[PDB]
Each structure stands twice: as C-alpha cells, then as structure tokens.
Design a protein around this ligand. Structure first.
Ligand code: DHE
Ligand code: DHE
Ligand code: HEC
Ligand code: HEC
Ligand SMILES: [Cl-]
Ligand SMILES: [Cl-]
Ligand SMILES: [Cl-]
Ligand SMILES: [Cl-]
Ligand SMILES: [Cl-]
Lengths: 540, 540
C-alpha cells in the first residue's frame, strides 16, 4: 500500500539552497532568440558545439558569459581572438545588430536539441532489399576493387567512378553531404554516412549497385566503420554521432540497430563532466574484436569489444582532448590519431590496449588517415599535414626494430604553406602528395605539393591541379589525394562551388603528368573520393 | 589561423528550428520558486530524483506537466494515485497553497545542482594520518572481528560497540546520516559513507580507533566498497553517488581519488538516454578483479575491472530497471540484487559476466544483502522479504547440483506483513529473522518474525523487540537484524526519534530469549549495525 512510500520518503541529501535557477540573461524576443539561434548553428556550433563547450578557452555558458558582460562579449565577437576565434564584425560577416543579439543569446541557457534513442532509430531503420533476396554472386561485371566512391557533397548523393574507365557508373541518393565512405570486410558492401547521421548500405553485386539498408543514428554524424577482425566479417557496423553524443552498433548485413552507448562522461585532462563529447574517427581492430572510437572533447579512445554485444565491454583509454581524424600505421597495429587542437598525435596500441605515447607536432595536425613510408635514416614512419602550419611531421612507428626512433617527431618537411588537409602516398609509389585546400592564397589552395621519397631532402614540385581541370569561375579548392587499386595514378578532387563546375583530376604517379580529367553535370561539389580496395585494406 | 577557422567553420548539420527554448511555465516569484523547490527535495526528490525522472509513470518534466495543466497536477498531488504516489492534501501534510506552488514549480525546467569532478574531490580529500605514521600492530586490546559499527543516523556519527561486552567503546563523527559500513579485506580499516557522500576511513589498530582519511565523492551517495580479489586487497576503494550520476575509485590506503566515471547513459528496457541514473549497491567480485556496480534508473550492472586503473575496462550488463540493494549467494559467485520497483530479482554471474536470470517476486522486494540457507528440499536458496506485501521469496542458487530449482522462485514464506526491509540468518543458526520496519501497524513495526529452518512449514514466532527495550514514548521502529561472529546472538536496532530514547536489543539465537539491551544517551536514532567479521566476509 504505502509502506514503500514511507521507505523512499526521506528527504534528499541534496541541499535545495545549492540547487539554482538558471536566469539572469537580457530579455530576448521569440523572433530575436530564433534569429541568433539560426546564426549560432550556421556559424558557431561547429567549434563551440551544441552546448557551447566544444572549444578551448572558457565556455559560452551563462555563468561565464554573464560574468563577462554584454559589451565584453560584443567586443570579443567583433574582433575575435588570435587563438582561433575569428572576428565577425571587422570581417563584415555579421552586423552590429546581429552581434548584439549573439551576445544576448549566449547569456541565455543553451537550447537543447532532442535525443535519439532506439525508438527513433528503429523507425529510421529501413531494409530496402532483404538479404534473402540479395544476389549470391556479383551480377554486374564492374571492376569493383578499383571503384572510387566520390561524394557529391551539396547534391546529397554519391557517385561510383570506375577507376580505369574514368566514367561515372552510377549516382546514388544518400544523406546530405556525405563525409566518408567505408567498405565492409568482404568488399561487397559500401557504407556511406551523411553529416545528418543517415547511413546507407550499398550492394556492389546487384545488376547495378543498389541500396539495401538505411538507418539514422542521430542528428549529426561523421564516421562509420565495419568489423575487420578475423571471423567477424560483416557481423557488425559501428557509427558515431556528434549529436547526440553517442555511438551505435548495428547488424552488418541489415543495419538493424542493436546497441546505443552514450559518450557523456569525464574528460581525461580535467576529469570533469562534459555534456557533449562528440564521437569522431572510428577504426576497426585487427588484433582484437574491437572498434577503436575517438571521443573528441573528453580525449578518450574507446575499445568497443563486439565479442558479446549483449554484455558490452569497453576500455576507455586516456589520450589528449580534441581527438579528431587518424589512421593505421604500416603494421596496422598502432592507431595514429590527431588530437588536432591539442597539437598532439596520440598512439593507440591496438594489441596491448594502451596508449603508446603522445607526440608533439605542429600547429593543428590534420592527417586524415595519414601516409606511411620507410625513411632511409629513420626506418618506417607515419606522416601528417597541418592546418595552422605549413609543416609535415614524420613520426617513427617501428618500436621493435627502431626503438631509437619511435613515437618521436624525427624530422620535418615543409609544404606550400598552411591550410593543408591530407597527405598521401602508396607502397608502389615513390611520391608523397600534400594538398593545401584551406590555404588563404588562391594559387596555393588550388595546387598540391609532391615530394620525392627517393630523395627526400629536395624541394617539392607544385602541380596545378585546378589549372589542368580548366573549369573557369570558382575558388576551385583542391582536396584529398587518393590512389587507385594499382597505385600508379593519384586521383584529385576540385571542390568547386555547387553552382560552378567541378571535376576529378587524375595524375600519373610514375610521370607526375596529367592523365585524365573527369567532368559531368552530376559531379556537384566533389569532395571525398574513396578507392574501394585501398580503403578496404587500409592502403595509405 | 584563418585556415583552421574556415575548416571548422562549416554550418552544423543541426536544424535550428528543431532546437527549442524551454520556458512556457506559469510565472513564479523567486521567493515562491525556492519554497516549492525546498518542498521538492524535502518530500519528492527521493522518488522522482533531482531531474524528476526517477519514478515510474510519466516524468514531471515541463513538456508533460504543462500538457496536463495546473488543475490536473494540483489534483494528482492533492489526491495521489494507488501506484506509489502518496496523497499530500487528503493527508493534510501539505497546505492547499503549497500544492498550487508545487504544481507550478514542476512546470518550470528543473533546477540543477552542481557537478562534482576531480577538483572538488581533491579539495575535499583529507589524509588525517599518513600511512607512515599508522601502527604496524594493533595497539588496542579490542576484539575487532566482533565489533559492531552502528549508524547514529541523525547524530551525524557512528558508534563502535563491543559484541560480547555490549558497551560502546568509541563514537566517531562522520558524514550526515551514514548509510552503510564496510570493512577492508585486511579487516583493519572501517569504511563509512554518509548520506551526504562524505566517506571516512577508520583505523581500528590505533590505541583508540581514529579517522585516518576523508573524502567527499558527490553531494548524495549510499554505497562504498573495497577490492576483494586475490592480490588486490586494500588496493582500491570505490563509492557510488546518487548525484552526480557517477562513481569514483580511490586508493585503499589514503582514499586518494584516482578515477571518476559517469553513469549517465541509455536504459535497458527502452534503450533511451537517462540524465540521472543514480548508483545503488556495489559489491566486490571474487572471480575477477572487478567491482559489480548497480545503476538504478537504467537497470544496468557494471563490471568495473581494476586490473589497469588508468585504462578502465567496464562490462555493461542489462537487467531490469530500478536496481537497488543486493547480496551474494552462499557461493559468493552469483550477485542477487533486487530491481525493487520492477518486482524482479536479477542474478548476475560474477564469473561468466552475464545475467543468469530475472526472477519474479513480490511487490517491491527489499533484501538488503539477503539471507542464504539450505532448503531441505530445494537445496541452497537465497531469500528476500518485500515492502509491498508480507511475502518472503526463496530462490534456488545451485546450478551445479540443483539445476531444476536454479533461479526459480521455488517457494514462498509469509511474515507479519508488508513493510519489511531485512531478512537475516547465519551459517551456525537454526533461525531466520524478518523485520517490519515500515509496517503501518505500531506493534508489527515493533516486532520481528522468526522462522525455523528445521521446520519451515511452521508459522513464525514473534519477538517484541521494542517492548523488551522498555523505552517509553516513540514510534519505536525496529530494523535490521545482524549476527555476531560466533552467531550466538542477533542484534536489533530500535530506531526511535532523535528526541526520544532508542536502544540496541540483542537476542539469544539458540533460545530466542532477550540477552541484552544497549541504552546510552549517545545512541541517537540507531539504524544500521555492521558486525566487522560478518560484514568483511559476507556472512549472510
Ligand atoms: C571525424 C572526422 C573524420 C574521420 C572519420 C573516420 O575516419 O571514421 C573526417 C575525415 C574526412 C575525410 C576522409 C578522407 C580520408 O583520407 O579518409 C574527408 C574526405 C572529409 C571531408 C571534409 N571534412 Fe571531415 N570534418 C570533421 C570530422 C571528420 N572528418 C569536422 O568536424 C569538420 C571540421 C566539420 C565538418 O564540416 O564536418 C570537418 C570538415 C571537413 C570538410 O570541410 C570536408 C573537406 C568536406 C565536408 O564534406 O565537410 N573529412
Ligand atoms: C543503495 C542502497 C543500499 C546498499 C548499498 C550497498 O550495498 O553498497 C542500502 C542498504 C541499507 C543498509 C544496509 C543493511 C544491510 O543489511 O546491508 C541499511 C542499514 C540501510 C538503512 C536505510 N535505508 Fe538504505 N536506502 C536507499 C539506498 C540504499 N540502501 C534509498 O534510496 C532509500 C529508499 C532512501 C534513503 O533514505 O536513503 C533508502 C532508505 C533507507 C532507510 O530509511 C534506512 C532504514 C535508514 C536511513 O539511513 O535512511 N540501507
Ligand atoms: C572555430 C571554427 C570557431 C568559430 C567558427 C567560432 N568560435 Fe568562438 N571561440 C573559439 C575558440 C577556439 C575560442 C577560445 C580562444 C580564446 O582564448 O579566445 C573562442 C572564444 C569565444 C568567446 C569567449 C569566451 C571566453 O573566453 O570568455 C565568445 C563569447 C565566443 N567565442 C563566441 C562566438 C560566436 C558568437 C561565434 C559565431 C556567431 C563564434 N564564437 C564562432 C572558436 C570558434
Ligand atoms: C515515492 C516515495 C514518491 C514520493 C515521495 C512522491 N512521488 Fe510523485 N509519483 C510517484 C510514482 C511511483 C508515480 C507514478 C504512479 C502513477 O500512478 O502513475 C508518481 C506520480 C506523480 C505525478 C504524475 C505524473 C504524470 O503521469 O502526469 C506528479 C505530478 C507527481 N508524482 C508529483 C509529486 C510531488 C509534487 C511530490 C511531493 C511534493 C511527489 N510526487 C512525491 C512516486 C512518489
Ligand atoms: Cl531517398
Ligand atoms: Cl566517463
Ligand atoms: Cl579478446
Ligand atoms: Cl550507455
Ligand atoms: Cl581478469
């Protein structure tokens, strides 16, 4: 009756005088609030995050913002900061009236976007073609290993480009602005994820590659990955979300949602609670049946063991805050990940399940998956490009046979300048390609630098990738070099405007000569290109 | 710098129109809000939680509460429901004007108490006596294994009573309303955790037992535990918190804070995010170097492996919502814990790291640690009483030599009625005791039922514990039977008010006749009683 009521009726130990109401912000209309909120996610949420704690420095919470004041915040938004906070008034990007509204907005409690659990996922889950009715053999005659999965960012779709043919073979509708493409261990299924957290599974064996499953694992995402460990091929596919701060494990044949795990938790450096730790790069392990999951704001690398997904076991490894992209080393044991805004590179030992070291590097490293090669003096190494730096950092990745040079910034190369984004090579190649996508100089932003590994002390050659495309108007930012299955050509993307004309430019790695140019009215804002074989077997 | 700012300056994939502002509640003054907020934690937070999502039914969040309306909520609060929601108007416990305020308060966004990270812990952390300054031998002449640690709830302290002398040997100030007492594997250090989350470690080898370390792991807590795996004795001490939803691991010798882990995460039944999953019972594994941690609202049981404390591995086991108290079986392998308000008992396999079964029992089981004995027909069993009915459930715990009765509610026993909290026995005892602390009948609450393991079909005997104390005015509620080391005597608390007289009653287990009554002006609101040896070695 009420005996259990009296049992739990005791007063909470929490002192009510220490629980506080959240107000004290300047009055804002409903129309005004929504206008600043539209600006925040259009211009600010990328760094500061949904809850405004995703960047360095003091956060944009009420207690902090109200302490500064209306005019401090207006002043700091108008003129920015030399530590990565741009200026929105001096640049003319925002208006005096708008900046005033932003200063008022961040003094209010940050509005919350909704959660996304199993009910939301299962409703988003669609098996368009059931595995029973899927082909048992490759129907088409495509040379799938040398297929490129090219992202048509603004078009909300992806294009399959036959490597040798240089022609588009199909265009598939996907989530908006796909970020990466990943292959299943079998090589039959192509996985793509949009920044809106929609995943699509493509069957490369159908008469024409078709989608077979679909699911939305959140509101904002970046990464997807498939199980690579011996015996667990196509068993499970993982995907991490920016919001909600979580990742999800799904069946690898149907994408059925199985498990959802929150990444909300304590940070490695300060060991305080963080309400929005965004999941970034995910990579499958060869040593154990685990997914190595990067968690950005908390600086944790998680080892998600799918041996038993009903009773999940996770090992949380401390590294450095702001974990971002990364990739394997030549051995496929040591996961080199870039804690970009910590200017460090963490080394995750997938075998011993620990952090091998933290390597100091240049200003904001950005390697993507990186580039591995054998240095004459320093043995095997792993290299990264940089955004705030024009440098290239080489890191020893050979502890067994090169303890002298291991997890050390053994040597630097210098590229065309800052704004670099991806560094690329190939085992069969003697060159090292470095793009300058976000360099503020036009010429540099549409060129790439090529180093000669045969003689590494020489200066690089500059290749005019955009010039070779002969597009015309547009910024024509070049981005992301990728090799073919055979390794003797290097594909480039000219990330021109949505309403301008773009292209993919293919270079002969043997001669460093223009080999071909890919143009098509369907190839809108081409960004990421992913060779099936090279991506599937971590060739980089 | 602009390079990195353009790279991370892309608009968020989050639609601002789907990120909504949280204020549509009826206006309240600051004086009125703080009065309703005070009643909430004084009367309601125990069940509904800090964020109003800890009870069954629909939560008291703005979206739901505003939908009902002011008149609906006033009525429901005024009258209640027959499903665990007490009456507050018919009761006459809250005035008509307070209920109106409470109805408005729960329509506002719930106020939030602060977090409690490593900085807050370290400043709260005190080492009163260094390990170097502690004795290498037991200075005092006390029979430590037979000492009782008695909680003096309202006095904010505990008393150490000598089992055979029946006298109080010292009184030690602690956190407010200590909840449990635990002993180190070495049996030298007594650990007590306050209702307010303050932990005190007591050295029983000093000339007089003195506090040697102190730490606050949160704002509200209930549970504390020590590592009991071979080779890891006294190496780590763990404690769980109600708020913030987290647990923490400290050094066993100094209580230095080492790690903090957030229990915020997804539930087991709906697989949705819960922002306040408060930690409940915690027990130390013998099969592996792990802590078994109960997480209430999410219904998860976490196996926290301390093999490597810097890289913490945690297996998450699903069970049923509202996990609470629990205990070992006779084997010390299967953790029998009760999801109270799910009316089930979960069996967690300490060895295989999985859920062996979910057993349906009575309304709101409350076992504490439980009571193990050998049923003449059904083999080794684990028993529990309930709050919602006078039932006593027996559950087989022998899968090796009694597989047909394993994890089955093999039989039921009837006590005096509902409102029971603790059932007890001893390996050297022929009797089985059940209390009725929260029974609404005065005499029932003052008595305890006693069963005969030699003849289970016989009706219980009733011993009037409070009557035997001869205390006078007061509710004189009796609670928590506890044996001594030799199992000769059974101790009971008479949990009277702080301005009334209380006592500890001791009964001769071999004869069931009163053996002693402990009265003392320092014995204020005695609740928990913890024999050092029986608590240390999990004898129940
Ligand atoms: C987590 C993450 C990965 C690795 C996932 C993995 O390995 O599993 C990744 C890699 C990538 C890769 C993989 C290339 C590779 O070599 O693997 C590409 C092409 C890429 C195109 C872009 N990224 Fe990416 N990217 C983010 C996050 C990520 N970028 C951002 O947070 C940021 C700064 C904001 C955003 O706009 O998403 C960001 C900006 C960009 C771009 O502006 C690019 C150039 C175009 C776009 O669509 O946004 N990111
Ligand atoms: C999590 C938890 C444990 C086990 C910890 C472990 O094993 O590591 C426990 C066990 C206990 C034990 C251990 C006895 C045993 O045999 O193990 C005792 C004496 C006890 C005295 C009370 N408990 Fe307890 N108790 C709660 C939580 C807990 N009770 C509540 O949430 C609730 C309902 C609210 C509250 O007031 O704290 C609650 C009410 C009570 C009481 O009213 C008692 C009788 C007096 C008091 O201090 O509030 N609880
Ligand atoms: C990165 C791509 C950013 C974008 C886009 C915006 N901000 Fe930012 N901000 C950023 C960093 C790395 C820092 C801290 C660096 C430092 O030491 O200054 C900041 C700082 C602010 C602050 C100051 C908070 C404080 O320290 O007291 C405010 C008030 C702020 N930022 C607001 C803001 C607004 C309104 C933006 C767009 C409308 C915005 N920022 C964009 C990184 C980035
Ligand atoms: C247990 C010890 C409780 C205490 C003390 C309080 N409440 Fe409660 N409440 C409880 C349960 C188990 C339920 C659900 C039962 C059901 O019939 O659904 C509730 C329900 C409410 C509701 C209704 C929510 C809804 O579905 O709309 C309200 C508005 C509510 N409770 C408020 C409330 C207040 C204001 C209290 C003290 C001041 C309070 N409750 C105490 C459990 C317990
Ligand atoms: Cl579609
Ligand atoms: Cl955590
Ligand atoms: Cl393993
Ligand atoms: Cl979780
Ligand atoms: Cl082990």
């Amino acid at each position: 009756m009420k005996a259990a009521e009296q049992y739990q009726g005791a007063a909470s130990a929490v002192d009510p005088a220490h629980v506080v109401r959240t107000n004290g912000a300047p009055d804002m209309s409903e129309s005004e609030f929504n206008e600043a909120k539209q600006i925040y996610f259009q211009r600010c949420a990328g760094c500061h995050g949904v809850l405004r704690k995703g960047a360095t420095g003091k956060p944009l919470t009420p207690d902090i913002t109200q302490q500064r004041g209306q005019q401090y915040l207006e002043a700091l938004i108008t003129y920015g900061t030399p530590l990565g906070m741009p200026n929105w008034g001096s640049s003319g990007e925002l208006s005096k009236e708008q900046i005033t509204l932003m200063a008022k907005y961040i003094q209010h409690t940050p509005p919350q976007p909704p959660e996304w659990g199993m009910p939301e996922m299962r409703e988003s889950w669609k098996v368009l073609v059931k595995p029973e009715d899927r082909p048992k053999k490759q129907l088409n005659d495509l040379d799938l290993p040398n297929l490129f999965s090219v992202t048509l960012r603004d078009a909300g779709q992806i294009a399959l480009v036959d490597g040798d043919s240089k022609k588009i073979v199909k265009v598939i509708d996907t989530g908006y602005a796909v970020h990466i493409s990943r292959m299943s261990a079998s090589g039959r299924y192509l996985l793509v994820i949009g920044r809106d957290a929609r995943i699509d599974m493509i069957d490369l064996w159908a008469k024409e590659p078709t989608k077979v499953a679909e699911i939305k694992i959140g509101i904002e995402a970046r990464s997807v990955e498939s199980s690579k460990f011996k015996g667990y091929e196509d068993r499970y596919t993982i995907a991490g979300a920016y919001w909600p701060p979580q990742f999800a494990i799904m069946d690898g044949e149907t994408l059925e949602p199985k498990q959802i795990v929150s990444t909300r938790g304590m940070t490695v450096d300060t060991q305080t609670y963080h309400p929005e730790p965004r999941v970034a790069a995910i990579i499958a392990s060869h040593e154990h049946p685990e997914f190595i999951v990067n968690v950005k704001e908390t600086g944790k690398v998680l080892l998600v063991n799918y041996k038993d997904i009903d009773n999940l076991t996770v090992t949380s490894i401390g590294a450095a805050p702001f974990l971002h992209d990364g990739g394997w080393d030549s051995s496929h044991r040591y996961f080199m990940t870039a804690a970009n805004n910590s200017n460090k590179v963490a080394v995750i030992d997938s075998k011993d399940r620990r952090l091998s070291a933290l390597v100091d590097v240049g200003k904001t490293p950005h390697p993507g998956r990186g580039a591995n090669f054998v240095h004459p003096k320093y043995g095997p190494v792993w290299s990264t490009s940089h955004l705030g730096d024009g440098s290239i950092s080489l890191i020893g990745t050979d502890p067994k046979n090169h303890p002298q040079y291991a997890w050390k910034k053994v040597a630097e190369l210098q590229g065309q300048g800052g704004g670099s984004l991806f560094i690329k090579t190939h085992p069969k190649s003697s060159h090292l390609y470095v793009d300058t996508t976000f360099n503020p100089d036009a010429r540099i932003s549409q060129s790439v630098a090529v180093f000669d590994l045969k003689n590494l002390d020489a200066k690089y050659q500059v290749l005019p990738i955009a010039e070779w495309a002969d597009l015309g108007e547009g910024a024509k930012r070049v981005v992301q070099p990728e090799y073919n299955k055979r390794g003797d050509e290097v594909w480039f993307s000219v990330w021109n405007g949505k309403n301008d004309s773009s292209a993919l430019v293919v270079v002969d790695d043997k001669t460093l000569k223009l080999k071909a140019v890919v143009k098509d009215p369907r190839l809108i804002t081409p960004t990421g290109k992913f060779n099936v074989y090279n991506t599937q077997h971590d060739v980089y």
